[PDB]
Structures are given as C-alpha cells and as structure tokens.
Amino acid sequence: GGGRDYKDDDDKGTMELELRFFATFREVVGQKSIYWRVDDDATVGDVLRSLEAEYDGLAGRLIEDGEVKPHVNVLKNGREVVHLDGMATALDDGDAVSVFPPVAGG
C-alpha cells in the first residue's frame, strides 16, 4: 500500500486530537480548541511541526532545533510536556494537546 492517508474513512490509522490554543497561539489560529486528524503514530512534536505549515503566525515559534522550544508551555491531556517528552510523549485518539506561547521568564 501507499503512504499519506491523513483523512477519515477506509484503512489509514489516523487519530483525532483536541488542539487547544491559548494567548498569542490562540489568536493566530483564531480558535481556542479544534480537532485535527493526524496519524496514530504522530506525536505532539509532529502536531506542532504540521501546525506551522498551516499557520504563518505559528512559524518557527513552536519548534526549536527539533524539540518544542525554550519557555513555550505545551501540554498533553493537561500534563505540560515541557517537564517530560515534548516531541514524543503518548498521543492517543480523542486526546487534548493544550499550547501556550513562550513566556518571559526573566
């Protein structure tokens, strides 16, 4: 079989995630919570990787050097993945990835 099956219906193995945006990231998307369709294997890092490919207002500020970003507050089922694996935590179907832009910690 061929690759790229990032849709609903038929075999594809894509899951659906509630991507909750807050602060700057919220007004960029213009939406405070959405439901995206990525593959089941795709994790929080792939999600924000793809998010900038859509939104110019998210470009660069959600990826730093292949990880999420210093000071950016990104979450996963309410658990802020900056304290754990940001790029590849545990993303399953019906989940909720919450995101906040990088905070001035000095």
From Swiss-Prot:
There is a cross-link at K32, K69, K76 (Glycyl lysine isopeptide (Lys-Gly) (interchain with G-Cter in SAMP3)). Keywords: Isopeptide bond, Nucleotide-binding, Phosphoprotein, Ubl conjugation, Ubl conjugation pathway. The C-terminal glycine is likely acyl-adenylated (-COAMP) by UbaA. Coiled coil: none annotated. The modification Glycyl adenylate is found at G106. One of its GO terms (molecular function) is nucleotide binding. InterPro entries: Beta-grasp_dom_sf, MoaD_arc-typ, Mopterin_synth/thiamin_S_b, SAMP1_3, Sulfur_Carrier/Prot_Modifier, ThiS/MoaD-like. Induction: Up-regulated by the addition of dimethyl sulfoxide to aerobically growing cells. These conditions also increase the levels of SAMP3 conjugates in cells. Disruption phenotype: Cells lacking this gene grow similarly to wild-type in the presence of either DMSO or oxygen as the terminal electron acceptor; thus, SAMP3 is not needed for DMSO respiration, suggesting that it is not required for molybdenum cofactor (MoCo) biosynthesis. tRNA thiolation is not affected. It comes from the Archaea. There is a cross-link at G106 (Glycyl lysine isopeptide (Gly-Lys) (interchain with K-? in acceptor proteins)). Gene3D superfamilies: 3.10.20.30. Functions as a protein modifier covalently attached to lysine residues of substrate proteins. The protein modification process is termed sampylation and involves the formation of an isopeptide bond between the SAMP3 C-terminal glycine carboxylate and the epsilon-amino group of lysine residues on target proteins. Seems to be able to form polymeric chains with itself at Lys-32, Lys-69 and Lys-76, similar to ubiquitin and other ubiquitin-like proteins. SAMP3 appears not to serve as a proteolytic signal in the cell to target proteins for degradation by proteasomes. PANTHER family: SULFUR CARRIER PROTEIN CYSO, SULFUR CARRIER PROTEIN SLR0821-RELATED. Monomer. This is Small archaeal modifier protein 3. It comes from Haloferax volcanii (strain ATCC 29605 / DSM 3757 / JCM 8879 / NBRC 14742 / NCIMB 2012 / VKM B-1768 / DS2). The gene is samp3.
